Swiss-Prot record:
Naturally occurring in which organism (per UniProt): Escherichia coli (strain K12)
GO terms, biological process: lipid metabolic process; proteolysis
Enzyme class name: hydrolase
Phenotypic effect of disruption: Cells lacking this gene do not show thioesterase activity and have a little protease activity against Cbz-Phe-ONap. No effect on the cell growth and fatty acid composition.
Protein name, UniProt field: Thioesterase 1/protease 1/lysophospholipase L1
Active-site residues annotated for this sequence: 11 (nucleophile), 155, 158
Record carries keyword Signal: yes
Impact after mutating residue 74 to A: Retains weak hydrolysis activity
Any one GO molecular-function label of the UniProt entry: identical protein binding
UniProt keyword annotation of Flavoprotein present: no
Amino acid sequence: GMDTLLILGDSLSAGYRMSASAAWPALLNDKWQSKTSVVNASISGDTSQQGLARLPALLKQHQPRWVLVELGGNDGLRGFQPQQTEQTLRQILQDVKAANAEPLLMQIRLPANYGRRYNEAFSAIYPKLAKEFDVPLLPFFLEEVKKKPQWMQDDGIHPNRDAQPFIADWMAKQLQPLVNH
Ligand SMILES: CCCCCCCC(=O)O
């Protein structure tokens, strides 16, 4: 069958100030034809808590086989306590499993210039939770994308439209073993 991959993300998955069809999850959907459906449920600026609030309706609506969780970066960019982000992500993972879906957790990291003790503590939540729940820990693309000015919006913060096909292709490669086309 054609399973659904739900992406529960922030602007890194929604695409910042662009059409939904331009963002990498839509490009991935198109690449996969109808082998697997990709539903992007991502909103620019969402905290992990905001994503968690949206999740139950999405699980009921979409009944996904897998849920790619790409959240917590906004919490970290706002200097929220790591334990709160950890706990919120923990709840998301519990809810995804309890809906008979497989969570996939994307590592998030803050930029090299961010406060270092804080950034280490923030980034450590992701391998911790992936081990705790025994779920896939997906790699994070943003630092590589930021190396290409031609893939970044004028702020040097958000990937642009031209980045999206590259991200889609890379994500397709990371997700190949999971969807087993
Ligand atoms: C550096 C951590 C990743 C942050 C991405 C979220 C930005 C936004 O949602 O507008």
